[PDB]
mmCIF file of C-alpha atoms and ligand atoms in Angstrom:
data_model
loop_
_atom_site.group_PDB
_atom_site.id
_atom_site.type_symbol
_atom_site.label_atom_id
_atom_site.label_comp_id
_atom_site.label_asym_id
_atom_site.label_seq_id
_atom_site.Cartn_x
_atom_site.Cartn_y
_atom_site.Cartn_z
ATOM 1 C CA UNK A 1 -34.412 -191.893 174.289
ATOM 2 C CA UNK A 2 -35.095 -192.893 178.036
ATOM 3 C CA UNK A 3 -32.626 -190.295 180.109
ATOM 4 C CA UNK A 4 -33.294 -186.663 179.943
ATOM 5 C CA UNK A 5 -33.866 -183.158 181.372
ATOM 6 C CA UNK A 6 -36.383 -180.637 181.374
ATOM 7 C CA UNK A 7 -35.547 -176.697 182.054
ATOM 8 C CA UNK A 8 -37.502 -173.773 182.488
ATOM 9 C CA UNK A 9 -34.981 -170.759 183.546
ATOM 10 C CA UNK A 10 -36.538 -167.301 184.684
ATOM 11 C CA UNK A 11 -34.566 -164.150 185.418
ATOM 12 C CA UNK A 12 -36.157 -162.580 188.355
ATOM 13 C CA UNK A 13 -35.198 -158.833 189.903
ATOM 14 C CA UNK A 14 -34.041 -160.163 193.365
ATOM 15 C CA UNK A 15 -31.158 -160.791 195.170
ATOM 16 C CA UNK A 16 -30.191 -164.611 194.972
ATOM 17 C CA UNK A 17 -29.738 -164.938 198.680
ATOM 18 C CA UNK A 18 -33.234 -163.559 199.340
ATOM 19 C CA UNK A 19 -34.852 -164.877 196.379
ATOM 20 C CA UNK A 20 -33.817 -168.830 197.543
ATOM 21 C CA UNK A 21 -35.168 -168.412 201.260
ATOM 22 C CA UNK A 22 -38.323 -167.078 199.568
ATOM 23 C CA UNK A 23 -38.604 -170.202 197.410
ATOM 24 C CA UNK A 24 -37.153 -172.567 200.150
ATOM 25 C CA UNK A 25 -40.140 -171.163 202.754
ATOM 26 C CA UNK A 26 -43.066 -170.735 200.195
ATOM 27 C CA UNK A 27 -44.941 -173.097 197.733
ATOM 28 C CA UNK A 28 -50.636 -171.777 194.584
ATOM 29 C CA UNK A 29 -53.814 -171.473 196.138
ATOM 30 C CA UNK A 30 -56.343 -171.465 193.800
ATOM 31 C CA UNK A 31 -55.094 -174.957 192.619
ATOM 32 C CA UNK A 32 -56.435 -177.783 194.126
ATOM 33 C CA UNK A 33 -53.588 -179.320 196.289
ATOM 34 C CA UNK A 34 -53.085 -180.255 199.794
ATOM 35 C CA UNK A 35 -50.201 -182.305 201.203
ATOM 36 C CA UNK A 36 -49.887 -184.449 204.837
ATOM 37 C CA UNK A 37 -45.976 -185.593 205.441
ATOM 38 C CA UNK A 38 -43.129 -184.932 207.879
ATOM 39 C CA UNK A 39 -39.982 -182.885 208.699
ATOM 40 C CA UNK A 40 -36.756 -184.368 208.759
ATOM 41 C CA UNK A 41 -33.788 -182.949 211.132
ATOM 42 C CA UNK A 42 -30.385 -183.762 209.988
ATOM 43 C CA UNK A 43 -29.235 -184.284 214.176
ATOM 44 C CA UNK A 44 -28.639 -181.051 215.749
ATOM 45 C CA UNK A 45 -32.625 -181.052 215.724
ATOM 46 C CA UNK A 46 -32.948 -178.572 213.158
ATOM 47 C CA UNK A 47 -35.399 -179.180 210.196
ATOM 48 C CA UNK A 48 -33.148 -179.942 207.106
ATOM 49 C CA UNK A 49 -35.494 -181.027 204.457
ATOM 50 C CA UNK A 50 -38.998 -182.796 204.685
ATOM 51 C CA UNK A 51 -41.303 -186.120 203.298
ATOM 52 C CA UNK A 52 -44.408 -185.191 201.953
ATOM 53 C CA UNK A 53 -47.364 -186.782 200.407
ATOM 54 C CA UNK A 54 -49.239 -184.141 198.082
ATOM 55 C CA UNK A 55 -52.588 -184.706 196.311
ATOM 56 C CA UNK A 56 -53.110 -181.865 194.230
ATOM 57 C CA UNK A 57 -55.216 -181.619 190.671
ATOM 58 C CA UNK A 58 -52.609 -181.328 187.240
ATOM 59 C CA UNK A 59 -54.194 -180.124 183.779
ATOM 60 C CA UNK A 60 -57.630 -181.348 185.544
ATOM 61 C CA UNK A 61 -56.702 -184.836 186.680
ATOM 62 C CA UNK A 62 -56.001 -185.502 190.581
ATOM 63 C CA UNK A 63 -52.880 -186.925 191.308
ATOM 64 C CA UNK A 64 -51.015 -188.243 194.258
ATOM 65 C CA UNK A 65 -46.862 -188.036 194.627
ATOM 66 C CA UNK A 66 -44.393 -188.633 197.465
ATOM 67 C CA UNK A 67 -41.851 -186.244 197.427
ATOM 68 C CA UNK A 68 -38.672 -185.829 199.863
ATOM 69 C CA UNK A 69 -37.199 -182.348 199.929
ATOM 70 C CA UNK A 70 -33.666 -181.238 200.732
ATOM 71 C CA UNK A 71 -32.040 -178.218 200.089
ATOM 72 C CA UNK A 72 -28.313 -176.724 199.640
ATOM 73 C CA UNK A 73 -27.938 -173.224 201.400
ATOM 74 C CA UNK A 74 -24.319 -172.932 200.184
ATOM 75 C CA UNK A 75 -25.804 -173.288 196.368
ATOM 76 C CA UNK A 76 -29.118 -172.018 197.065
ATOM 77 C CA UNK A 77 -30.572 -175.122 195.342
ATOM 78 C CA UNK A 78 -33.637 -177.214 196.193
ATOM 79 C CA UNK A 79 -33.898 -180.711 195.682
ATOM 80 C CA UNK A 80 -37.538 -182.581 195.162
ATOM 81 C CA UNK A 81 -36.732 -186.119 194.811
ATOM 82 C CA UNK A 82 -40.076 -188.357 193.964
ATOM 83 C CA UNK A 83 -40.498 -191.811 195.180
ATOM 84 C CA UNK A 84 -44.277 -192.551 194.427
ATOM 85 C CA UNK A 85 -47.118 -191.684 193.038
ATOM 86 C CA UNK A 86 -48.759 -191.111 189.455
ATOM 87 C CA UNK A 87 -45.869 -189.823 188.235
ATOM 88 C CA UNK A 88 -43.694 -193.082 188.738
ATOM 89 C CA UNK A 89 -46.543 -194.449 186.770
ATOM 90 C CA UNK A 90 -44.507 -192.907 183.691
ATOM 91 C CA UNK A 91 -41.259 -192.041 185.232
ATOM 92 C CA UNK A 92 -38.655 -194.846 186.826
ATOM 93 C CA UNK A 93 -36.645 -191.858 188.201
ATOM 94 C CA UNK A 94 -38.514 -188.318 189.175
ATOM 95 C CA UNK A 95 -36.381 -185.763 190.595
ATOM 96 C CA UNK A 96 -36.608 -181.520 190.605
ATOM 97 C CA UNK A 97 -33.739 -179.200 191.245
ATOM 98 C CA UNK A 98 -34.267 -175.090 192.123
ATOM 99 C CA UNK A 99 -31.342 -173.430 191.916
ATOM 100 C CA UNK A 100 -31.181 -169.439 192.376
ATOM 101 C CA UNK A 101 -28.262 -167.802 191.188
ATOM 102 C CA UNK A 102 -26.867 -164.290 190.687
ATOM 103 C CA UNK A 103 -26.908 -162.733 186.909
ATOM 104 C CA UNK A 104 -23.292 -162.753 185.901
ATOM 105 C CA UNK A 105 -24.957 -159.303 185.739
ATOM 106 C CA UNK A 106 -24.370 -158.405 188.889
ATOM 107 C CA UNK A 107 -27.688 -157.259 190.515
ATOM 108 C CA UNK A 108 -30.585 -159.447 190.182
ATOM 109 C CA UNK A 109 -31.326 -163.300 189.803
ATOM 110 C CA UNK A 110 -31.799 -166.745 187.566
ATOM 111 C CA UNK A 111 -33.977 -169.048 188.694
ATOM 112 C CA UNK A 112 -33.596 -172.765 187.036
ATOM 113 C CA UNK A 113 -36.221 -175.592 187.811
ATOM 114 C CA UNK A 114 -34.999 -178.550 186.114
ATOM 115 C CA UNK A 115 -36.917 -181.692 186.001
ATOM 116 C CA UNK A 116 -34.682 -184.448 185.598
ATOM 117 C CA UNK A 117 -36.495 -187.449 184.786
ATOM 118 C CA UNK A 118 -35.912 -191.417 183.406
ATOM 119 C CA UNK A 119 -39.560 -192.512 181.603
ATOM 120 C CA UNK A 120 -40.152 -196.201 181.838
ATOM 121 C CA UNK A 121 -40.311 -196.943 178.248
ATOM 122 C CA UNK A 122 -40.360 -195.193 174.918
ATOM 123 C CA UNK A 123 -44.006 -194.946 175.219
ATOM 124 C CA UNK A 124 -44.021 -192.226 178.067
ATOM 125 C CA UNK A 125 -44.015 -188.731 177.573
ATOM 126 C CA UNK A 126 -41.882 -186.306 178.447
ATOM 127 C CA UNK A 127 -42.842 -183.871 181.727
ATOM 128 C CA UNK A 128 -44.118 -181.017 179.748
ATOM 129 C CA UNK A 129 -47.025 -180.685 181.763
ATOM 130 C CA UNK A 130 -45.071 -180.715 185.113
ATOM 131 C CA UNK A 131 -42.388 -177.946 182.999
ATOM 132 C CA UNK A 132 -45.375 -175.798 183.006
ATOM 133 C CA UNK A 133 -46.918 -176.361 186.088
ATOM 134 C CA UNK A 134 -43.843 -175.092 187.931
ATOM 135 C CA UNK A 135 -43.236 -172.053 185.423
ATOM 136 C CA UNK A 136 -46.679 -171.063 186.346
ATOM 137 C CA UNK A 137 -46.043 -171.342 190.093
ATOM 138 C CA UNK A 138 -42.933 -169.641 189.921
ATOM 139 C CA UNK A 139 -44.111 -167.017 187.679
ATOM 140 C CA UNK A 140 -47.256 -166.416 189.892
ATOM 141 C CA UNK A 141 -44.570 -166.228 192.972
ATOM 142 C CA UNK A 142 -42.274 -163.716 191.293
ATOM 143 C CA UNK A 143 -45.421 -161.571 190.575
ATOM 144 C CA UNK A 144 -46.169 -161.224 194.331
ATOM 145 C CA UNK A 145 -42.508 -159.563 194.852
ATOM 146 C CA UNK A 146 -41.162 -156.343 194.826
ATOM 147 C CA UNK A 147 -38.484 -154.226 195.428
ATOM 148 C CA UNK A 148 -37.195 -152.501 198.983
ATOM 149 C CA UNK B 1 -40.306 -162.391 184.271
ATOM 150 C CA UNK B 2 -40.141 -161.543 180.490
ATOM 151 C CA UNK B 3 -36.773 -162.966 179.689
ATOM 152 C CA UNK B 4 -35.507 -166.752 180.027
ATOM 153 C CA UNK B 5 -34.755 -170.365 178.457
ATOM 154 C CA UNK B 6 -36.025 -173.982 178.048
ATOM 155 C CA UNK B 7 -34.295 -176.583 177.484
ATOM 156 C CA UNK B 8 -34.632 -180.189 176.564
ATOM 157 C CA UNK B 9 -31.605 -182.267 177.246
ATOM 158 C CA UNK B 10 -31.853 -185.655 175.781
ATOM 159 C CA UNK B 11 -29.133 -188.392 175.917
ATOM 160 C CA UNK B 12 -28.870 -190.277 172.284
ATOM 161 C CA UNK B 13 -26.613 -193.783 171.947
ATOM 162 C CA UNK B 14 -24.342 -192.138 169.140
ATOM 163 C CA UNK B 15 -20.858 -190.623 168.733
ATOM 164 C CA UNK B 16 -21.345 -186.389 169.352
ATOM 165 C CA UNK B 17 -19.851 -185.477 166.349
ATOM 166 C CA UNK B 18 -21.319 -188.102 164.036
ATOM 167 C CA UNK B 19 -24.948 -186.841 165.487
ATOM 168 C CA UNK B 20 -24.164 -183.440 164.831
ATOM 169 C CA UNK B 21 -23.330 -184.187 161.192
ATOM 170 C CA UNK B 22 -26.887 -186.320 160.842
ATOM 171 C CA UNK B 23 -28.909 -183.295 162.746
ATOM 172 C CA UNK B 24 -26.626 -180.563 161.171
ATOM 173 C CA UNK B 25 -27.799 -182.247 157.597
ATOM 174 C CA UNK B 26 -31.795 -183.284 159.033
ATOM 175 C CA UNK B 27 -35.030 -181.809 159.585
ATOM 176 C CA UNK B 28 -40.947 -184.646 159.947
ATOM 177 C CA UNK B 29 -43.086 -185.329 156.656
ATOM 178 C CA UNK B 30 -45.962 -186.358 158.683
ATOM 179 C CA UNK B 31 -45.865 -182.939 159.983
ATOM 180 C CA UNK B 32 -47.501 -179.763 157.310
ATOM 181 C CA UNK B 33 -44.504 -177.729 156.652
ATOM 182 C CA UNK B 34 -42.583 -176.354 153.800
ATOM 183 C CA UNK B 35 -39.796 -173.556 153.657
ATOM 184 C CA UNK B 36 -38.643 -171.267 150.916
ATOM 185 C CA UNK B 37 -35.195 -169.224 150.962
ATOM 186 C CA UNK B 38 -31.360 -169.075 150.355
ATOM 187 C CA UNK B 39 -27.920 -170.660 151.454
ATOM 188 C CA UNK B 40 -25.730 -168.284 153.128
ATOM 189 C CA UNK B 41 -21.945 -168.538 152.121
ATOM 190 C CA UNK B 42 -18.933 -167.251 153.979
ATOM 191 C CA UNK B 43 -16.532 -165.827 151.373
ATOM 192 C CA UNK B 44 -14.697 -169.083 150.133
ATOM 193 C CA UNK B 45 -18.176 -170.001 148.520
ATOM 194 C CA UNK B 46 -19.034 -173.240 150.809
ATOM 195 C CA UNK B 47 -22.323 -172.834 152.412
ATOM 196 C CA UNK B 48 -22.293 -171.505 156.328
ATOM 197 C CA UNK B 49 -25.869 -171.390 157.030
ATOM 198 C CA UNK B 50 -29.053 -170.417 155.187
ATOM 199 C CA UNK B 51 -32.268 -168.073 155.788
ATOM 200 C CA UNK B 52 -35.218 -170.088 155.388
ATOM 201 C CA UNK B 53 -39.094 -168.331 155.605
ATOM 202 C CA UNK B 54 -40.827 -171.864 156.927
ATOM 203 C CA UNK B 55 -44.412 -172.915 156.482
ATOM 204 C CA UNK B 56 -45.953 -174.989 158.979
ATOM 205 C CA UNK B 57 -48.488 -175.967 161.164
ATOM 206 C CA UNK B 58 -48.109 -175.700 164.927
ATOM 207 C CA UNK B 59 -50.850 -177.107 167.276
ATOM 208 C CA UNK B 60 -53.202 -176.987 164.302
ATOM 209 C CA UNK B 61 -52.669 -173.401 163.599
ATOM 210 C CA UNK B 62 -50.942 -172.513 160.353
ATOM 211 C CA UNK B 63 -47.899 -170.114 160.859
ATOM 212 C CA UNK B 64 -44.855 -168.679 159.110
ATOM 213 C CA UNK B 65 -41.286 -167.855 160.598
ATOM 214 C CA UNK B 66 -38.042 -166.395 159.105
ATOM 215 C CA UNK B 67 -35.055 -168.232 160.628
ATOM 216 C CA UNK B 68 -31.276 -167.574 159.922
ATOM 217 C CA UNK B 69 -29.462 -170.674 160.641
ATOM 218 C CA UNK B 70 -25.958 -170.867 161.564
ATOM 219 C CA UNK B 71 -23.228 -174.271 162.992
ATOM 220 C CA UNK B 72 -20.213 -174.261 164.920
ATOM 221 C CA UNK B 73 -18.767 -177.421 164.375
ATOM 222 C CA UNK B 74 -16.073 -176.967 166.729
ATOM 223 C CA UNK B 75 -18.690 -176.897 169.370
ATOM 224 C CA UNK B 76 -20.867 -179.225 167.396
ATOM 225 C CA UNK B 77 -23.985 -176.197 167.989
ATOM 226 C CA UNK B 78 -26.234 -175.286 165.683
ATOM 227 C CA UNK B 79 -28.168 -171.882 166.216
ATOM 228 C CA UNK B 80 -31.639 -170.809 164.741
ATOM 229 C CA UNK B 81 -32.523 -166.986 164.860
ATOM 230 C CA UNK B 82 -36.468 -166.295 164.244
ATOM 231 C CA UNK B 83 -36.721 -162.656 163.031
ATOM 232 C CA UNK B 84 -40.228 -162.612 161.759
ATOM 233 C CA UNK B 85 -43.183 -164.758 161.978
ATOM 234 C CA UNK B 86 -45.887 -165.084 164.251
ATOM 235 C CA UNK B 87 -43.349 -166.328 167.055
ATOM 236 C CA UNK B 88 -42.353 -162.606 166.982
ATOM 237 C CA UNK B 89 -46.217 -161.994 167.883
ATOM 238 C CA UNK B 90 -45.358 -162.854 171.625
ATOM 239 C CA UNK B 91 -41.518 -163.034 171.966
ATOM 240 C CA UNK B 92 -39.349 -159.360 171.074
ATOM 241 C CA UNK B 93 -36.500 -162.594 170.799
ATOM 242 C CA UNK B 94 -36.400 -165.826 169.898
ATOM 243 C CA UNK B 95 -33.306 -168.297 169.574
ATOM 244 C CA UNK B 96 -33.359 -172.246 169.119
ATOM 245 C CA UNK B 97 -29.723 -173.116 170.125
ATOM 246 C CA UNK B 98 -28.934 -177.110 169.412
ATOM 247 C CA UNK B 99 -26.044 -178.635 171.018
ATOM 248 C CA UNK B 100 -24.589 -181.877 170.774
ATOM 249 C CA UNK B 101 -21.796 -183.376 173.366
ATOM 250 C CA UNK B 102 -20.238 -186.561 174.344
ATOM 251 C CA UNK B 103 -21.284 -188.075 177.609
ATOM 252 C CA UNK B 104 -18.913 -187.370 180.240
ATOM 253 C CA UNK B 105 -19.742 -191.328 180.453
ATOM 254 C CA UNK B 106 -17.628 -191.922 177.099
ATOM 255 C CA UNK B 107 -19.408 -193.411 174.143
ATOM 256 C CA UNK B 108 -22.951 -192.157 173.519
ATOM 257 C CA UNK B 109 -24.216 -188.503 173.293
ATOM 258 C CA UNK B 110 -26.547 -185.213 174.819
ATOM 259 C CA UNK B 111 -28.619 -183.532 172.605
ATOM 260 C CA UNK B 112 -29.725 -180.149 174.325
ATOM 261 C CA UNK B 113 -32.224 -177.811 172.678
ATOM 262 C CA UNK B 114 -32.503 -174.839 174.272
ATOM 263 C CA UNK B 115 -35.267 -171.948 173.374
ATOM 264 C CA UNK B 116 -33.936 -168.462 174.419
ATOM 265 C CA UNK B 117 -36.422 -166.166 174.391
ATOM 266 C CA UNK B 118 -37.661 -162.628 175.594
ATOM 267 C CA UNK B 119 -41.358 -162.016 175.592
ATOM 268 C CA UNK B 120 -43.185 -158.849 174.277
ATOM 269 C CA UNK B 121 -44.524 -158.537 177.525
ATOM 270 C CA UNK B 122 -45.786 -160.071 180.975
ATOM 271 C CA UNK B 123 -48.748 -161.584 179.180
ATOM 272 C CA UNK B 124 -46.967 -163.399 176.198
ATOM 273 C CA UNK B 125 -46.743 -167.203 176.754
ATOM 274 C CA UNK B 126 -43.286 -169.188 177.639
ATOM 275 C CA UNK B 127 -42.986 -171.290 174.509
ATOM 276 C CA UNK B 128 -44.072 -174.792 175.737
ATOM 277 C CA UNK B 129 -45.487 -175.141 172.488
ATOM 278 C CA UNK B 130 -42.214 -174.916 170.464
ATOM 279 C CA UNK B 131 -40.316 -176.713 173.339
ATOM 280 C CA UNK B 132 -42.421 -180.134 172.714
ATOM 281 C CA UNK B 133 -42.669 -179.712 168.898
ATOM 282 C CA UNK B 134 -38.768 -179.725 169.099
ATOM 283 C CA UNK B 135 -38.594 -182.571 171.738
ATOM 284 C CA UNK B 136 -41.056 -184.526 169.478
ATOM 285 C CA UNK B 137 -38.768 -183.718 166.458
ATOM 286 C CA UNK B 138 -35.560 -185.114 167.822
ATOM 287 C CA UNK B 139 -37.036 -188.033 169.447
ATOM 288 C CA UNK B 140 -38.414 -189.217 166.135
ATOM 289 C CA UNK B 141 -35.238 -188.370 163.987
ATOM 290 C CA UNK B 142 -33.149 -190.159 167.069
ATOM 291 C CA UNK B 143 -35.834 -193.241 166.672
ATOM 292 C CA UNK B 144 -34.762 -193.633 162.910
ATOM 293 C CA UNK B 145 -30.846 -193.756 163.822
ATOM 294 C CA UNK B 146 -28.743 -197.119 165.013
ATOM 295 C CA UNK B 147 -25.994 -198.690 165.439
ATOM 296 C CA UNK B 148 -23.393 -199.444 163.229
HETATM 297 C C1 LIG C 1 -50.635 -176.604 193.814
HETATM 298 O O1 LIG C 1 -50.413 -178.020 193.891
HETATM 299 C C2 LIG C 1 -49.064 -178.150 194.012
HETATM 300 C C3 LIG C 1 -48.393 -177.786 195.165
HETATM 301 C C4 LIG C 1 -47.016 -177.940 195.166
HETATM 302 C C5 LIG C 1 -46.357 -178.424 194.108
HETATM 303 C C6 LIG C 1 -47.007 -178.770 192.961
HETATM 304 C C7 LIG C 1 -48.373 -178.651 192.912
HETATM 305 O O2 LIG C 1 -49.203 -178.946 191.821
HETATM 306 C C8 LIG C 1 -49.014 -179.822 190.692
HETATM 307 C C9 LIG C 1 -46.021 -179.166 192.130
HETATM 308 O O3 LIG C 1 -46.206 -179.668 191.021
HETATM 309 O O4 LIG C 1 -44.778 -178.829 192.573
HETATM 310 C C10 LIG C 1 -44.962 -178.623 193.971
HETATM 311 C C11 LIG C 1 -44.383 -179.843 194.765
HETATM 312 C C12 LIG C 1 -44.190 -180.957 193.912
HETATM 313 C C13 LIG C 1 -42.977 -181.170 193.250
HETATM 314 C C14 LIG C 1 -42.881 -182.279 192.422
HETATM 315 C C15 LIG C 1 -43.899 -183.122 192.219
HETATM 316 C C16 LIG C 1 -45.073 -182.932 192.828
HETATM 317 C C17 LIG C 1 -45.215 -181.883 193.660
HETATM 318 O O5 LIG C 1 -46.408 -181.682 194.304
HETATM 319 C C18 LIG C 1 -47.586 -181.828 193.524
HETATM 320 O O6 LIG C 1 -45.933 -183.934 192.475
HETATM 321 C C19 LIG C 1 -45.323 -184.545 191.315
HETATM 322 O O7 LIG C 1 -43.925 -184.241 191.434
HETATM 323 C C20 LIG C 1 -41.857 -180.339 193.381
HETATM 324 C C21 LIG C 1 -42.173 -179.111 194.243
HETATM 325 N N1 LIG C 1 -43.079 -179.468 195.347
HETATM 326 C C22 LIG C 1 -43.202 -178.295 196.225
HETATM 327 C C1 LIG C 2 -42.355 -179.748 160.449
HETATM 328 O O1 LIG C 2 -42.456 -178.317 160.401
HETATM 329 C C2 LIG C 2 -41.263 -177.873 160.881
HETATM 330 C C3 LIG C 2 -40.088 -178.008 160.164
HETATM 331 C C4 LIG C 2 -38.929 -177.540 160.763
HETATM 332 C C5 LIG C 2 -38.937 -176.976 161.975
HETATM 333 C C6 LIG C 2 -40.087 -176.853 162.696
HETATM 334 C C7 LIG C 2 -41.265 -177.286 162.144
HETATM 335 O O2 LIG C 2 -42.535 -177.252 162.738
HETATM 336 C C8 LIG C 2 -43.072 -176.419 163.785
HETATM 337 C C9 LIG C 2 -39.690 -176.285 163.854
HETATM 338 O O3 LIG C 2 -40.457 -175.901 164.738
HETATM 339 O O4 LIG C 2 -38.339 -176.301 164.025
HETATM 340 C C10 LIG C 2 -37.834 -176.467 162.703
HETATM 341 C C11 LIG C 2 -37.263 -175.105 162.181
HETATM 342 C C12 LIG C 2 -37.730 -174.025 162.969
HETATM 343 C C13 LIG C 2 -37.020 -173.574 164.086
HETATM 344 C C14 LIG C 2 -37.558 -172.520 164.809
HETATM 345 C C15 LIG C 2 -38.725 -171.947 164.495
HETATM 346 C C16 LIG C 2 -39.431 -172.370 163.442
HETATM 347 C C17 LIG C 2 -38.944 -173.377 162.692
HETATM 348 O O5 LIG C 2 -39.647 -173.812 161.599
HETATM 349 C C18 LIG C 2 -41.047 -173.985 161.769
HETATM 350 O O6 LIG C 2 -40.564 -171.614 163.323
HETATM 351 C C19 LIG C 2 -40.688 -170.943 164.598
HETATM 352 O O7 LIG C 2 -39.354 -170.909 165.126
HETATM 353 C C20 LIG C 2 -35.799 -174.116 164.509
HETATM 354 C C21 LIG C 2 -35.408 -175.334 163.664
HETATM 355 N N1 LIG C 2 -35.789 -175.137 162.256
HETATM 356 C C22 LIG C 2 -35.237 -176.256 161.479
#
């Protein structure tokens, strides 16, 4: 089993709207990360997305990835699509999706990070530590919002 | 954020309904576990589902869990239903919902587990634990299966 997907999905007491430009404009500080990189305009000269190189410190280990971001106002959904790094060490495809959507509900949101992934053989693991490395950051974002 | 799901989706080369029957029918030896309970019937005497209190070892911890099992074979689901056990230390809910589908592709199969759970409150854990015991279940039963 080579192809599959991780989720982690969140409810969250926010607007969907507001909760995505939220996510879209804010990324942890007390972990060890920093990242160099690039914007990218789509041709009206307006930033659509951006190439970054992170180095940042997961379950204790420092790490390097390359990651291009895009992102879907119309779905509220943020693409993270990695080319390099340690992860493609275990991964031959390495891609996260953030999608914010209303509750059928009505009134507040549910926030999906899935991590869809392709290992390189049977002998990789699974992204479990990534799964929980972006619950955490999420989480820890949510906390830091309130209402009005 | 006290209520929400994982999920691990994993694609399987076998027919959807002929996996559901093997994982409907399934459960590690390596693994220290042992349940006690009943079959559940639904009226014309054929069993439905059963209510199992499990035994087992979790992350080297020894724990127990009451589960109601139930299947939807039109849907090809199976759905677990924890109502005691030291899950229900952190979680006020916990549901293990299995579903298997055809690819869209055609021939082979997903395999999604998803954990729905609510959490006692904001300092319970997500279940990351039971997430990769799960994973690591499937994968190995999915290792012993082939063609033909
Ligand atoms: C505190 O340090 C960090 C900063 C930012 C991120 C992470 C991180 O700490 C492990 C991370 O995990 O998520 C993001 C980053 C990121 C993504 C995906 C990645 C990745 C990333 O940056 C490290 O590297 C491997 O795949 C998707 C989202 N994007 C914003
Ligand atoms: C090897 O030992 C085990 C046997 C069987 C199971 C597990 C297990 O080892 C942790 C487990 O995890 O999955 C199943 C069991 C089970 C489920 C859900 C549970 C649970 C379970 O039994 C321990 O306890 C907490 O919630 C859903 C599926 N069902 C069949």
């Amino acid at each position: 089993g080579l192809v599959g997907k991780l989720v982690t999905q969140l409810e969250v007491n926010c607007d969907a709207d507001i909760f995505y430009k939220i996510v879209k404009h804010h990324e942890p500080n007390v972990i060890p990360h920093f990242f160099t990189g690039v914007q990218v305009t789509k041709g009206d000269g307006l930033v659509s997305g951006c190439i970054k190189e992170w180095n940042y410190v997961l379950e204790g280990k420092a790490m390097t990835a390359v990651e291009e971001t895009t992102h879907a106002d119309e779905t509220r959904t943020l693409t993270h699509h990695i080319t390099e790094g340690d992860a493609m060490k275990d991964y031959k495809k390495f891609d996260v999706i953030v999608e914010t959507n209303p509750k059928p509900n009505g009134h507040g949101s549910v926030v999906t990070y899935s991590i869809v992934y392709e290992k390189i053989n049977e002998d990789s693991p699974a992204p479990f530590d990534y799964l929980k490395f972006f619950h955490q950051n999420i989480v820890d974002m949510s906390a830091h919002i309130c209402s009005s």
